[PDB]
């Protein structure tokens, strides 16, 4: 399908950056993720880790700093379904990331690391990607 | 009847604010516009005047301060077509507005007036507005 998708962001990202991700959640998906990483090394810091878990019915947001994960935040319910397509907008603003799913504001994740450290977007897990666009 | 559509921006707009306009260009459309205004009074300043012209086949960007227009910036081609539907994204960033038309970054307009004064959205002219959503 789309396999782990990687998009580089050399200049980083600033408030007013929009990540639009469209794809399908396959019939037997357990979970997938969208990470905003700070480098290409494995286990690199994550300004944001968005993780819809269909197997447990939760959507988790977290960060990873200096090798250790922070405290997990959970969104309101699971707006994703196995066998259904989706569209997610992850908008960077001054104070955090707005996560919009299916045309509705879903969760706001206050910044934990400086937006300026982000260098790569990675998408992986049980999802079949249509497209990942960054505006 | 061409009564323009008017939409309030309750918390105003800041870097990270996304305007999503969906519509369809009428068959005999001449031109249409999206205005970001600073007040509800006829003749208020326009932080942004985005005006695609099918007849002159050119898209004009411009601001209007204290009654008079300013330096007009044109964009690359006409990403709109008569009788066809379009989806436009206007993204406010720290240094300007990014206009995205159907999956592609179209033009970047640097702030002339301050984001802080913008208070409403106006869409008028030859266009069938389907919806305006602010994220
Ligand atoms: O500046 C935006 C403003 O343009 C007016 O038309 C301009 C036009 O851009 C230019 O080709 C010509 O030389 O001058 C005209 C008038 O100053 C439009 O009439 C107005 O609706 C806006 O779109």
Swiss-Prot record, chains A, B:
Task: Please list the residue ranges annotated as the Galectin domain.
Answer: 5-135
One example of the protein's molecular function in GO is:
carbohydrate binding
- List the induction conditions: By p53/TP53.
Q: Which SMART domains did the record assign?
A: Gal-bind_lectin, GLECT
Alphabetical list of InterPro entries matching this protein:
ConA-like_dom_sf, Galectin-like, Galectin_CRD
Identify the domain of life: Eukaryota
Q: Residue span of the signal peptide, if any? A: none
Residues annotated as binding a beta-D-galactoside are: 69-75
Q: Which Gene3D superfamilies has this protein been placed in?
A: 2.60.120.200
**What tissues is it present in?**
Mainly expressed in stratified squamous epithelium.
Q: Where in the cell is it found?
A: Cytoplasm; Nucleus; Secreted
Q: Which GO terms describe its biological process?
A: apoptotic process; heterophilic cell-cell adhesion via plasma membrane cell adhesion molecules
User: What keywords would UniProt list here?
Assistant: Apoptosis, Cytoplasm, Lectin, Nucleus, Secreted
Establish whether keyword Cytoplasm is in the entry.
yes
Q: Read off the SUPFAM superfamilies from this record.
A: Concanavalin A-like lectins/glucanases
> What is the role of the protein in this entry?
Could be involved in cell-cell and/or cell-matrix interactions necessary for normal growth control. Pro-apoptotic protein that functions intracellularly upstream of JNK activation and cytochrome c release.
Assembly behavior? Monomer.
Q: What is this protein called?
A: Galectin-7
| Biological classification of the source | Eukaryota, Metazoa, Chordata, Craniata, Vertebrata
Underlying gene: LGALS7
